């Protein structure tokens, strides 16, 4: 099984962008990062940042998640990012995304020793 910090990078890491680089970003990241394997991921955020700023948030701002939890950090500086949603025209085997680039805020839920981020809860 993969542990969460390495699931949270395959997911939302993508440092060798600064940028999503066109309207098929999306499309392109959600199969060869393998979320859309069996069934297509609704949505998905990736972090165009090194891995060791988006690894510091976990010692930035603790704010509540969403959920209630108090494990959530809000990074200080906006980050850039990108936001994969699936279309009306998305149909598993043939997923769809739009692609938002946006430079937010971002909170990720912290967890373990290193403590790191395991989720990402939400941007701002
Ligand atoms: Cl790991
Ligand atoms: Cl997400
Ligand atoms: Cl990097
Ligand atoms: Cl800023
Ligand atoms: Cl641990």
């Known amino acids: 099984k993969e542990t969460a910090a390495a699931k949270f990078e395959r997911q939302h890491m993508d440092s060798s962008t600064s940028a999503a680089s066109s309207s098929n970003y999306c499309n392109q990241m959600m199969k060869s990062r393998n979320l859309?394997?069996?069934?297509?991921?609704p949505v998905n955020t990736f972090?165009?940042?090194?891995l060791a700023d988006v690894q510091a948030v976990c010692s930035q701002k603790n704010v509540a998640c969403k959920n209630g939890q108090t494990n959530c950090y809000q990074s200080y500086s906006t980050m850039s990012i990108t936001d994969c949603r699936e279309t009306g025209s998305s149909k598993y085997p043939n997923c769809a995304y739009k692609t938002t680039?946006?430079?937010k805020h971002?909170?990720?839920?912290?967890?373990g020793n290193p403590?790191?981020?395991?989720?990402?809860?939400?941007?701002?």
Request: hydrophobic fraction near 40%; charge should be negative.
């Open 36 to 41: 859309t394997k069996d069934r297509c991921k």
């Open 47 to 50: 972090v165009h940042e090194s």
């Open 101 to 103: 680039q946006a430079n």
């Open 106 to 111: 971002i909170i990720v839920a912290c967890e």
């Open 115 to 124: 403590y790191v981020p395991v989720h990402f809860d939400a941007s701002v």
